[PDB]
């Protein structure tokens, strides 16, 4: 009964704008911020910004200032992200999602933008970098899998882990470095603090073959690891 329903795939010309919607239901719209996230095929997640409709607080990733504009219509419980001045570098899957990593984590189904030099934003030299050493990892059913994420600065224990399967939205596994999200199988454990974080999958099953991503929420902008695709040996 919680739902975040995004608008349909968009196909546009370079230089156009698009406005992607995120219709929220099944909770009080005012009580949770809606975040926006960009995913490029085979590549890492990037945090765009949030809008907090209950207190009209809007925060952007500096990288997306001049590219993204977030609004929210309390009358329709709808969050909007407008992307302006579009280039091929804007072609991606865009997600809306609820809250920070934790018990209210919930994702829209995603919206694919397809756009028919160097005008895009850059990360700050100050931003935390989350490095997953392996882009690909092989296992056998029943083995233990360890996926590690190194942060470029002390992020304390404000680290989450997500699973994502093709055409599906990310699913929260772990937050606060070691806390399992409701419903996640016992075999998923998280550990770590400071700069070193690990997701362990004990007794790994075929349904666990997927991409895994770490995220720090110690400081803005929120940043994600590059992802590890776990596959069968």
């Amino acid at each position: 009964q919680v739902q975040l329903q995004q608008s349909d795939a968009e196909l546009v010309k370079p230089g156009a704008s698009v406005k992607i919607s995120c219709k929220a239901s099944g909770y009080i719209f005012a009580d949770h911020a809606i975040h926006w996230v960009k995913r490029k095929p085979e590549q890492g997640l990037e945090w765009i910004g949030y809008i907090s409709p209950g207190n009209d607080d809007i925060k952007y990733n500096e990288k997306f200032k001049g590219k993204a504009t977030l609004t929210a219509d309390k009358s329709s419980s709808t969050a909007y992200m407008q992307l302006n001045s579009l280039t091929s570098e804007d072609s991606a899957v865009y997600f809306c999602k609820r809250s920070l990593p934790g018990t209210f984590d919930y994702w829209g189904q995603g919206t694919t933008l397809t756009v028919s030099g160097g005008g895009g934003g850059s990360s700050g030299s100050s931003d935390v970098v989350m490095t997953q050493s392996h882009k690909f990892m092989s296992t056998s059913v029943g083995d233990r899998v360890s996926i590690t994420c190194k942060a470029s600065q002390d992020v304390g224990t404000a680290v989450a882990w997500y699973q994502q399967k093709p055409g599906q939205s990310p699913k929260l596994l772990i937050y606060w470095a070691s806390t399992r999200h409701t419903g996640v199988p016992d075999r998923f454990t998280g550990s770590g603090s400071g700069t070193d974080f690990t997701l362990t999958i004990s007794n790994v099953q075929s349904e666990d073959l997927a991409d895994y991503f770490c995220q720090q929420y110690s400081s803005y902008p929120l940043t994600f690891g590059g992802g590890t695709k776990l596959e069968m040996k």
Binding site: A30, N55, S99, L100, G102, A158, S218, S219, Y220
Partner: peptide, 7 residues
């Protein structure tokens, strides 16, 4: 962040 504010 990392803590969140109430309504």
């Amino acid at each position: 962040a990392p803590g969140s504010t109430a309504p």
